[model samples]
Target: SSEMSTICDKTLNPSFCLKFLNTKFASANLQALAKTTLDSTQARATQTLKKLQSIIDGGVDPRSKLAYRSCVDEYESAIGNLEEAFEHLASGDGMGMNMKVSAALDGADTCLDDVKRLRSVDSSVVNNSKTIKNLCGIALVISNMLPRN
Candidate 1:
């Protein structure tokens, strides 16, 4: 649908949105589409959080501990934000949803910066954080399609 394509066009990564949102559904109305994207975003955050926890529990270098620990906290909070964003979206509170998604976006950015400050870090950390942020961006863009109250 043209509207659906417009949603991807407004996102930070059009290809990412296109690939991610290409779902099996009858329609591309704003609410359901946004919910699907939010689901994907939450899953990514949850996965990143688990990986961060595993890295910490497995005994990371002291120097890397603080950075990875910070990421764990950020991702945890981001997951919470995404869940609350879903609540807002379900209630038709677009502004509230936007705020929560923005919070999650900031969480990803903070985590990315935390890890980036480390001298030796896995590329996976950077990639995971970036993917979360991109998905957040997509959620924000889709939320914009909702009419203003």
Candidate 2:
């Protein structure tokens, strides 16, 4: 236990702690922004999906729809950006892209799931808010664990 404590203490320096806290803070901010953006996107996607479903249900050509394609393209683009951000995070770039990506991915995932549900008359609804909340909580925990400089 003492040896472990020693290692922990060594790893938890003020400078390192500052960097970690800053990183966590920045990550949290990015994640929050991403969540907001994703939530907005999901709302839009849901609306579009509903409209498309209506068109299908009404015996209309969904292909000729304007917003449908635009919504899909926008959602896809957001998701792609989110994925890229995650790649940067996984690579430990850590300048803030990781946080942004994490958030964006979460948003994209939520939007995709919602869109999928609307597309298929029958699909499972996923609650990813909890997952994102947990991630933020974990970041806070890590931040707290760092030495206070």
Candidate 3:
């Protein structure tokens, strides 16, 4: 209780933030939590782009090149936003981090939604998008808890 409040003040979900960050990395403090969250989010964005790009290289479903193109565009948006999110985190700008993280999440969701619109069965993109959304959400929660210095 004491530890959580100190680390996660003002966050709507303190316990979730604390427990999520606490277990995700080696350290257990607010700054470390923020850094780790950003690290994970960035890594997820990079991994997602690679997977999506490789799919593009291998040739997407020719029936819906437009849908595939939309997914790729959305991933690029996410990669850009997540990169900005990292810069904000480094600067200790919680508001900027919040905005960037949410935008990144939106980008991921857009990609997933495109695939859904195209009626893609046996989709692996779901996992990538889900991972990005979860990681960005966790980062947003932690960012909310952090002091906006």
Candidate 4:
């Protein structure tokens, strides 16, 4: 509980960190918590990628289509980054984990900005991007707290 609170306190949003963890990992150490965060972030990104791909497949304005295509690639990289973060976590490389997660976080925003500029972008896409960013933020905070291997 002490470590958990410490982690939540350091994140971008203390309340979000607390709720994101939601006591499921009440007894988890920082490494485990961070890994869980990455896992969830990856899952969200994967789903978001599918949504973006569906949008592309469905046909839209050429300009929005280009943006969605780009967003899909961004999500692909974000998912890959999260996967690499898992390796870093396994190796106890906190800095490596942070770097990968940071990249993933930024990738989410690339999509976020693109979708935000368009009128046809669905709320779900925007929300997914935001949630991925939040999860990455939480994972980054937890990684910072973990000691180097």
Per-prediction tally of clashes: 0, 0, 0, 0
TM-score of every model? 0.91, 0.29, 0.78, 0.92
Best by lDDT: 4
**Stretch of 10 with least lDDT, candidate 2:** 3-12
Ten consecutive residues with minimal summed lDDT in candidate 3?
A: 1-10
The candidate, 1 or 2, that scores higher on TM-score is 1
Candidate 4: give the clashing pairs.
none
Report lDDT (Cα) of residue 100, candidate 1: 99
Q: What is the C-alpha RMSD of each candidate to the true structure, in Å?
A: 1.8, 13.4, 3.8, 1.5
Q: Candidate 3 lDDT (Cα, whole model)?
A: 0.72
TM-score of 2: 0.29
Identify the runs in model 1 with alpha carbons over 4 angstroms from their true place.
23-27
Per-residue CA lDDT of candidate 2, range 88-149, in tens?
44444443444554454455355444345344332211233223323333333333333333
- Name model 2 segments beyond 4 Å from true: 1-64, 96-149
Tens-digit per-residue lDDT, 43-66, candidate 3: 877777777677777776764566
* Clash-forming residue pairs, model 2: none
Error of 2 at 50 (Å): 12
lDDT of 3 at 134: 70
TM-score, predicted candidate 4 vs. hidden true structure: 0.92
